[PDB]
Amino acid sequence: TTIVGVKFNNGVVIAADTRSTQGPIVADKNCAKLHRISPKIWCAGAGTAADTEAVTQLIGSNIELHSLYTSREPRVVSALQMLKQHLFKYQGHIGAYLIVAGVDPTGSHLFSIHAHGSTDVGYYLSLGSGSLAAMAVLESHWKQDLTKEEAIKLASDAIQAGIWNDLGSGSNVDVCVMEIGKDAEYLRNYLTPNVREEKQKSYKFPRGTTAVLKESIVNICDIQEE
């Protein structure tokens, strides 16, 4: 997994690759790692995939109720405080490593959070097995006062470094841009540089190739009238 977060002029951008693996085997070639905590607070997860998803939805659920209770739009610091206190309580057993980014009435924010409950602030962050490849790109090209277009470019380039150089990362680049005073724009499959080439042969079988012992209709309908 390669995930990055990059601050820019009027907001923040988050990006991720789309490979999920089980050991050396690729389970899903187009996984969605960018998750929504709230409309304008998004995060990307590395580590135990179930934990990253579960902790996002739990805090996202409580954030929504908190937003309704307070009649205020949710803040990134609230998501952050709720995530870290939940994770700290479970002493790293919930293997969620997240980059949290978003905009709120206070402004634009970018945080990382680790499984044991520690958090960090930054203008650029990377997480996952491809984080070193991504951070190499970020440390080479990041500057202060990036534009929206420059930040999207930098973020996706950092993910690409992970895709090509980290075996744990691959396939596509997903991006989400959160700009102040605007709707967050989720860009699913922003880049697609790994389409499989056409195979040399069609493996469609002739009908009747497989040996069959018995056939029967399965009753999926309910108990019928009359």
Partner: protein
């Protein structure tokens, strides 16, 4: 079987159109203690080869002596020792690789990762890796330790495959190497600011640069960073 005591971090290298570049910092770490600050980890062999070594420094010094002895031995009864029968990068590597694999096979390794950079008699670039396990491989860019994780991605953006090598000048290659060393200084806790860089070119020969420093560093943005979440 042993454990490394005094250690050197990344060695990084790449091919370019007319030769090879190799670089390594001047630190000898003692665990987390940055003990020795004037350690040369690039060792030239003749005027056509530079051997870059990471890992255990005591084993590095042993290898350095083996290479010194190799030059002495090659000159014995050899009228063409400074001409046709001079040591090639390929000879030096194969010798080291033999030693490394033999030593691992006796369960007593030289605890190192080694990159042999040089130019052959016919002008061909030579760049190959060997380590404590006797594992060997070649690539347009090669790096050890942290360099493998952080330098290679950056260097591979310049030379991504074999066909990029003739398109890469010595200025672009050196620039990429120097930037990679800066990135490693930002991110490797066992690195130093001081490093050595060696260029082996088929036209201009061996250029050995000592006492280089990481420069043009970005730190100013640190002033705005406060707390770890909620603190203003």
């Amino acid at each position: 079987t042993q454990q490394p005591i005094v250690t050197g971090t990344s060695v990084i290298s790449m091919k370019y159109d007319n030769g090879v570049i190799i670089a390594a910092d001047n630190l000898g770490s003692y665990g987390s203690l940055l003990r020795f600050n004037g350690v040369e980890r690039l060792i030239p062999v003749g005027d056509n080869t530079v051997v870059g070594i990471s890992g255990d420094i005591s084993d590095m010094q042993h290898i350095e002596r083996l290479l010194k002895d190799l030059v002495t031995e090659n000159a014995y009864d050899n009228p063409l020792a400074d001409a046709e029968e001079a040591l090639e990068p390929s000879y030096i590597f194969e010798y080291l690789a033999t030693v490394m694999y033999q030593r691992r096979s006796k369960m007593n390794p030289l605890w190192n990762a080694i990159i042999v950079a040089g130019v052959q008699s016919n002008g061909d670039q030579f760049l190959r890796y060997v380590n404590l396990l006797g594992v060997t491989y070649s690539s347009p860019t090669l790096a050890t330790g942290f360099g493998a994780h952080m330098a290679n991605p950056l260097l591979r953006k310049v030379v991504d495959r074999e066909s990029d090598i003739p398109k890469t000048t010595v200025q672009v290659a050196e620039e990429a190497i120097v930037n990679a060393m800066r990135v490693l200084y930002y991110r490797d806790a066992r690195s130093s600011r001081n490093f050595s860089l060696a260029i082996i070119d088929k036209n201009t020969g061996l250029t050995f640069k000592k006492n280089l420093q990481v420069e043009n560093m970005k730190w100013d943005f640190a002033k705005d960073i406060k707390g770890y979440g909620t603190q203003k």
